[PDB]
Write a protein that binds this ligand. Structure first.
Ligand SMILES: CCCCCCCCCCCCC/C=C\[C@H](O)[C@H](N)CO
Ligand SMILES: CCCCCCCCCCCCC/C=C\[C@H](O)[C@H](N)CO
Ligand SMILES: CCCCCCCCOS(=O)(=O)[O-]
Ligand SMILES: N[C@@H](CCC(=O)O)C(=O)O
Ligand SMILES: N[C@@H](CCC(=O)O)C(=O)O
Ligand SMILES: [K+]
Ligand SMILES: [K+]
Ligand SMILES: [K+]
Ligand SMILES: [K+]
Ligand SMILES: [K+]
Ligand SMILES: [K+]
Lengths: 270, 43, 237, 243, 270, 237, 243, 43, 49
């Protein structure tokens, strides 16, 4: 609109300045009330030298910050099957990162690591075949290990083995919206004034993953970890970062606190 | 160097390799009236 | 950065003689839905001056125990003039805002207010928020946890959102122009509040002994560049 | 068959790898990218925004009050107002700021910092304070005389409510570590210095006025600031999967 | 500056010379006091023939000398986890090589070899999944096998299996300095006159590696060896090579000696 | 390779009539920090002739039990003239050197001194070096393990560093010009010593019976092409 | 899928391999390469610098004294001063030199050697010595007469303190082994010869002068020297991970 | 022969293939006054 | 042998994958495509009825 955004690949140089004794130029004087950040520059506050600065800005780009796998789910089968709802609020690290943007669009790379464990949770050197089926909302969800739904004629399935490298697939930007929302000041449905339906973007829920072992294990079970990596990231409206602990997987509910950093004896002692 | 696509959908593509930054003015100075550094802000 | 201003919208004109420039969120003024972003196929309604004018809400007193107050948009005007009528009768709404927060004291008083507009500001300090706090109406609601911004973040970092300050020694008003923000071309004006406008005191109201102690805070808002789709009978959340 | 020889690395899952992989929905067509205000391309755009410093981190200070630096009419001269380490990534007043949260997501930093101060006393309250940046070598200065021998700014209260103190990048190396963890890495090697505030003259008020007023403290990165080597933010943790 | 450095790919030829009976040319006369190395050449000390010498100089280049993997760490897990501080003073071979240069810049190739061993240190034919996480200074270090930090949403992690080929990644030149220092006549911090803070370049310490087994082993443990290979080597100021044994992993402390080579009976007996 | 010389820096002039050429470490004379290497953004101070002149340190006696002596740079001059003042008042320092070692005997004496300048010469023959040996001041310190160079290497291979010899039958002095060396554009002059200057006797002092036996060794050093950044109050290690 | 056939070698970890591998920090940007004096590109630059030979390796010699060759006024003629094998990579006087440390990092060598000697007697002390290089075939020469039949230099003491004896590359093969280990490989096949020093005339001194003086021994590689096949230096070892 | 880069960062590249040596003069003869081989060093 | 490095995903059977695979009857020649009324190309043609 009014304010333009130029593009750059290196931070700004420093150019030599000299002294100043004047009444026309007062760069140090500011007014925070305006809503603007100070615009006093290095060169104006002190006498500087020339510095050709080539320090890059690549590792702070959206793509460099978000572009790496992170844990989003971990579970074990119970009867050779397990149904997980695709939502990233279980594990806080990747969650706290995504919530730094208000809206964002991105593709994802899912990596699935599986291994067999016995009843005492001790890993076994056992190669077994496993199936991961994506069941969109409205599709019939498998009740158990051998239900008919695993024929998977339309639902996408991936079949690999605990002895093969981890499985991995890419996923497109799937929301019905034009971007995923990581903050939503509204309700899930019309005619509902209940706190249980507040702050959830239903279009952010695209289904569930149902995992099973193609054949039954005798006394052991499948231990699964799902990693997710954002790719081709586009984001809008940066947010105030999370400063208190997460409590609930599905909401941002928190416990108030009176300080963020630890106290010190005196404000005059560094 | 090589950047060629094997798969059909763009979601299969590797990470974007255009990692730059842009002017933060829309965030650091979203005001209507220009307030030059050499001037006093409130006049 | 002049210190005076006049804002004229429709049949309403506002003035201030102690302003501190004017903020335009994200550097973008309000714009209409483009043909390549639109999805709802029906011809929209555009009320014009009937809904795009200044509406003044009931004043709040800057008391000694005052923590702040917030209004949700478009909730706060969901029942005022023809703007509110249009909001109820249509399934879909889109629009920007022009906000003017007012608070004058004297040169014998001191205090500082943060005037911030936050996109998608969730009131999530309770497990099951009460409708009276998420959608407080024209009277708005009071802050209970200003330090954690009612959403588990640091009040100090709320400056990452469009804002101004009302520092009594410097200005008696704050002015903000906000564009429409959403991950959708349009949305329902009754089920979703896009912006929240908060006035939080960061430096307490103080004054020379005997000075006037009754200091109000008045908020005046104007819809701007609005459009509605999906006409039917009136409906509220 | 084309002769191949697989190498070490094969089968490994490096979380920062970058290969092309088959899409689960090959023919899927995403919704359009619509016009939304406020797009961000790099997080350096965000750390350049000023955010409030929790400078009054003392027992007696709770909540909002931890953002207020206290001033008051003196009856002595040259006194000290506040002191703090300028290091943006260590524990303390700066860890809950925008600059800090992001500096703490990385292992190395470089650049000049913007320290802006805004006075909030009454229009009739005047004063002059000196703010100084002391480069590495010893401990924070002990008196105004020692402080003014470094980089400083003398601030005069008036219509322009605020003043900026640029803590310029003065370092032996191109980058510094974001932590000063010493017991292992001996990273105190990187300490960037101190910032102290002192009364230049005094805060003077008319009869019956408040004799104490508040200063708010803002901080941001300058245009030559950059971060390197992403790492997990230390303040975000959990004891087990969330219910 | 004053002395230029020409580049060559073969050692110098020998050209035919003849006898000399003169008072103008005395190439054999030198003066070691100047600080210069003799410059008397073959052709000047004896009557030589022509020899087109094509012997190359490639295997003595910095890249050919340093460019090969070498052991830098070896350890076993204790409770399914182990934290190693990235420093190359544990094993002396690669250490003694790096200390031949004062300053140097180089990328590195890390190869990780892992296998399972029982309590008596006898290798087992057991394929288990393991995770290697790089934790930079200031990041929270995992206390044990299943702490939350292994979600690894920002920290780089590599997950492979003891049955898969060894794992391997490349690492850039990461110091805050403009080169790594292998000799440092200074202190780690200001205001410290203590011998414990002398001779350590803190910017040479970039963190630690934390290893774990994704699931618990029953009675056995992970045995790990980390190899490191310098690549794209750049070096300055060659140093006097190490002539006494290393004692400490973190410092160059040594025990004085009165001779380097063994003695012989007489200086006149070869 | 003439045997005479005159060295004039600032207000100080040095001469010798029995030199053995002049060494320039690594073939590089002292140079200022270039704009592409620099990182500290403040305008530097450049003392000029006030700090770039010859400073003579207290003499050392070549005794019978003499093993050698060393001085660390800039430590040895950290408290002399305006050079030392500038070193203390600034966080950062950069600079080169011109070194002139002196030792005359007679044509009836014999002995040989190695005069070497070593970059980053660590005094690590003790588990916890004493500050008095790592930073011995203007008086310098005595060698305890000259054969292992105090750092676990062979004295004989110290010739890989810039050096000259003072062989009494040939010369009465050694002259070295050293450039700044570091993995940094600049550094602290109080926390890090870039060069060490050692005078070690490899052939013992001997003479015809009755000849003068009191033979001193004097060291004279000059900062050259220096620059400082990060001004504040004075500070020492 | 493209048809492939993996071959022997697959999965192996050869420490000298040279493949391209994914970087852990794909987008990382290193600090600048600044101007630093003394850059080295090849280690041949280093073995060309003269370093002292520990020639006096006898019981009676400790420390610094092992670098001194002893001369003294004779009362007999044609006597021997010293002897040594010129082989740069075997145990003995040359193993602690620069030439030696590096020759010991490789398995084969080739080239002429620079043997420079510096006299350290008083200015009034004179003398003439003959230094000879005896090529392979028998044992070190037994007298001056046998020695002078080989490559030699007659050195006259004077203002120019030193003299160089070039031991030219005279070999049957283009390269020699760096060790003469015999019991297994029978590498004594490669012995390069001897270097002996003898009095040409005598060391003469004025009345009351020291009757013994010292010669220092320097060694370096000539410009036609090169090494092949890197191997671990035998002098660097340990009994277990360092504490 | 083939030398083509697959990965993004230069740290992934294989070893440098430019293995030469240079004149050792900065180390073997770092003196100001030239001392020709045919001449006497000290004059 | 050409140096290769296999990656995560190897060996997996994704039901929506799309690779070229050897034919069981390499030289087989199918019957001709004859003229048949009512061809459909997309199922959107059907939901419009
Ligand atoms: C067959 C392999 C499995 C592939 C799984 C594909 C699932 C589709 C991915 C949807 C990703 C959208 C996630 C967006 C937002 C998060 O859930 C938010 N934290 C919820 O508020
Ligand atoms: C995820 C795979 C693990 C990757 C590990 C990356 C670690 C970063 C490598 C740093 C290499 C710098 C080593 C430099 C100097 C030595 O430590 C010195 N011997 C210490 O004085
Ligand atoms: C356990 C068996 C693993 C060997 C499979 C590796 C196949 C080679 O892969 S290739 O380079 O694309 O031809
Ligand atoms: N749909 C199959 C079972 C599917 C499976 O086990 O793969 C049935 O009902 O027999
Ligand atoms: N962060 C996970 C454990 C991580 C893992 O085991 O991979 C938790 O707290 O449940
Ligand atoms: K630049
Ligand atoms: K200004
Ligand atoms: K700024
Ligand atoms: K040649
Ligand atoms: K000569
Ligand atoms: K030579």
């Amino acid at each position: 609109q009014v304010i333009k955004s130029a593009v750059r690949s290196t931070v700004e140089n420093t150019v030599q300045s000299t002294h100043s004794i004047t009444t026309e130029a007062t760069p140090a004087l500011q007014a925070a009330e305006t809503g603007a950040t100070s615009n006093a520059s290095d060169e104006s506050m002190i006498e500087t030298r020339n510095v050709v600065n080539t320090h890059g800005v690549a590792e702070t780009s959206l793509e460099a910050f978000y572009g790496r796998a992170g844990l989003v789910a971990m579970f074990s089968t119970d009867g050779g099957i397990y149904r997980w709802y695709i939502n990233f609020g279980e594990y806080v690290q990747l969650r706290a990162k995504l919530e730094l943007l208000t809206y964002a669009r991105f593709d994802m790379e899912f990596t699935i690591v599986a291994q067999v464990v016995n009843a005492q949770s001790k890993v076994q050197d056992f190669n077994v075949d496993y199936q991961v089926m994506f069941v969109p909302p409205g599709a019939s969800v498998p009740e158990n290990q051998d239900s008919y739904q695993w024929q998977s004629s339309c639902n996408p399935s991936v079949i690999s083995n605990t002895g093969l490298p981890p499985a991995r697939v890419s996923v497109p930007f799937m929301s019905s919206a034009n971007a995923y929302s990581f903050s939503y000041d509204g309700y899930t449905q019309f005619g509902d004034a209940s706190g249980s339906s507040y702050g959830i973007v239903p279009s952010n829920y695209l289904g569930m993953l149902v995992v099973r072992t193609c054949e039954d294990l005798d006394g052991t079970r499948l231990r699964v970890r799902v990693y997710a990596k954002p790719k081709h990231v586009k984001g809008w409206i940066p947010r105030s970062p999370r400063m208190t602990p997460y409590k609930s997987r599905y909401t941002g509910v928190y416990t108030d606190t009176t300080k963020f950093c630890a106290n010190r004896a005196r404000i005059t002692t560094a | 160097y090589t950047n060629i696509n094997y798969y059909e959908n763009a979601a299969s593509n590797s990470l974007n390799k255009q990692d730059f930054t842009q002017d933060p003015e829309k965030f650091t100075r979203p005001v209507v009236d220009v307030m030059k550094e050499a001037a006093v802000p409130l006049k | 950065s002049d210190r005076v201003a006049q804002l004229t919208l429709g049949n309403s004109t506002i003035t201030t003689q102690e302003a501190a420039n004017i903020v335009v969120g994200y550097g973008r003024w309000p714009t209409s839905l483009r043909d390549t972003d639109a999805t709802a196929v029906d011809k929209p309604t555009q009320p014009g001056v009937s809904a795009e004018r200044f509406y003044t809400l009931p004043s709040v007193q800057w008391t000694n125990s005052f923590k702040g107050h917030y209004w949700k948009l478009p909730d706060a005007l969901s029942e005022l003039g023809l703007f509110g009528q249009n909001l109820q009768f249509h399934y879909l709404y889109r629009g920007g805002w022009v906000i003017h927060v007012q608070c004058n004291a004297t040169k014998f008083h001191q205090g500082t207010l943060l005037v911030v507009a936050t996109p998608e500001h969730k009131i999530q300090s309770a497990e099951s928020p009460a409708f009276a706090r998420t959608n407080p109406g024209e009277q708005g609601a009071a802050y209970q946890f200003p330090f954690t911004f009612e959403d588990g973040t640091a009040l100090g970092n709320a400056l990452i959102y469009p804002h101004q300050w009302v520092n009594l020694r410097t200005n008696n008003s704050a002015t903000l122009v906000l564009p429409y923000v959403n991950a959708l071309p349009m949305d329902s004006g009754i089920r979703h509040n896009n912006w929240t406008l908060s006035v939080i005191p960061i430096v307490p109201l103080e004054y020379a002994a005997g000075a006037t102690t009754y200091v109000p805070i008045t908020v005046t808002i104007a819809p701007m560049c609005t459009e509605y789709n999906g006409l039917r009978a009136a409906v509220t959340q | 068959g084309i002769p191949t020889l697989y190498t070490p690395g094969s089968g490994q899952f490096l979380t920062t790898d970058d290969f092309q992989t088959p899409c689960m929905l090959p023919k899927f067509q995403p919704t359009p990218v619509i016009d939304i205000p406020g797009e961000v391309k790099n997080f350096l755009e965000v750390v350049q925004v000023e955010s409030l410093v929790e400078i009054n981190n003392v027992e007696s200070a709770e909540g909002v009050a931890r953002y207020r630096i206290p001033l008051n009419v003196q009856d002595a001269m040259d006194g000290q107002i506040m002191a703090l380490r300028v290091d943006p990534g260590i524990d303390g007043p700066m860890q809950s700021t925008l600059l800090g949260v992001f500096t703490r997501y990385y292992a190395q930093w470089s650049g000049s910092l913007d320290f802006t101060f805004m006075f909030c006393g009454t229009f009739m309250t005047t004063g002059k304070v000196i703010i100084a940046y002391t480069p590495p070598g010893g401990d924070q200065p002990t008196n105004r005389r020692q402080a003014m021998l470094g980089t400083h700014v003398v601030w005069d209260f008036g219509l322009q409510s605020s003043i900026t103190l640029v803590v310029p990048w003065i370092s032996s190396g191109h980058f510094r570590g974001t932590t000063l963890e010493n017991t292992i890495y001996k990273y105190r090697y990187y300490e960037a210095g101190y910032i102290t505030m002192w009364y230049q003259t005094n805060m003077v008020v008319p009869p019956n006025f408040p004799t104490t007023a508040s200063i708010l403290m803002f901080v941001a990165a300058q245009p030559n600031f950059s971060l390197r080597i992403l790492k997990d933010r230390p303040d975000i943790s959990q004891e087990g999967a969330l219910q």
